[model samples]
Target: ATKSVLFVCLGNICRSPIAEAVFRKLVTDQNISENWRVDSAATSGYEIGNPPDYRGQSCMKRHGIPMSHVARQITKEDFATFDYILCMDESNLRDLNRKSNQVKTCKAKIELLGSYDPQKQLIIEDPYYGNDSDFETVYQQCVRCCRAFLEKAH
Candidate 1:
């Protein structure tokens, strides 16, 4: 059985897609692709259909997962479609909630991506405000947490 998951960030051009690619890789690496449905979107429409930010793509491209997808704003249908709507930060959760009319569906699935990291507290760091090193750090965080999510799902 496959578990559907949706990763959300401030803009589809960065965090969420990166998380999606990383999580997708985690499942692929585990040879359990059939057991997971992974996707990503942004809370805002700022980057609809845009590729992941060049820097973010470059940051993650060097790793196993490649960033290649059209950005889409999170919609109400997403709540009904995805089992898990993971957020890159609290602001994202708030934005999604506001856009969904405070509907319970989207809010119910909303979770912090960093929450899966036991060793860290408040894990959702905004890589957009930082430099190249921060992007690498976020990538590491995604790899760790996404791998953890895969193990838990398995």
Candidate 2:
């Protein structure tokens, strides 16, 4: 069976989309994209139907990684659909856990993407309110942590 993962955040337009794009790049680079189902979502309804934030898009462009996503809120179906539910920060984690508990057949393993960071940086903070440099920081963190996650997941 193809392994699946969902990257999550407060709003789907920023960190999660970047993480999804970064992980997609990693799996594609490894020639294993077909074996993985990668996606992203938000815990809240905010930004639904919006494309990735411009700053995040620019950050990914600078890193030569493609970015594209329409923001959507998490649904009950997602809990049972994805094999892994990896999120950016504690707030996301708590929200996901609370939501997951309501799904009787939830099968995904919920966790913080930062948990895979070897640098001991355990949170990928939202860069929404910050400047362009903040988006760059999010890009860098997603690269490091997503690489580590790919190594482990593969």
Q: Residue 105 error for model 1, in Å?
A: 5.0
lDDT of 1 at 146: 83
Best by lDDT: 2
After TM-score superposition, what is the CA distance of residue 17 in candidate 2 from its true location, in Å?
A: 0.3
In model 1, the Cα lDDT at residue 93 comes to: 72
lDDT (Cα, tens digit) per residue for candidate 1, span 1-154: 4478989887787678888999887778778878878888887778887888888988886775767789998777888777777787888877876776745555236678787765674566777778888888888888777877666632
lDDT of 2 by residue, 65-113 (tens): 9887899999999998999999999999999999999889898999999
- The C-alpha stretches of model 2 lying farther than 4 A from their native spots are none
Regions more than 4 Å wrong, model 1: 100-108
Worst 10 residues of 2 by lDDT: 145-154
Supply the TM-score for candidate 2.
0.96
Residue 128 miss distance in model 1 (angstroms): 2.3
What TM-score does each of the candidates earn? 0.88, 0.96
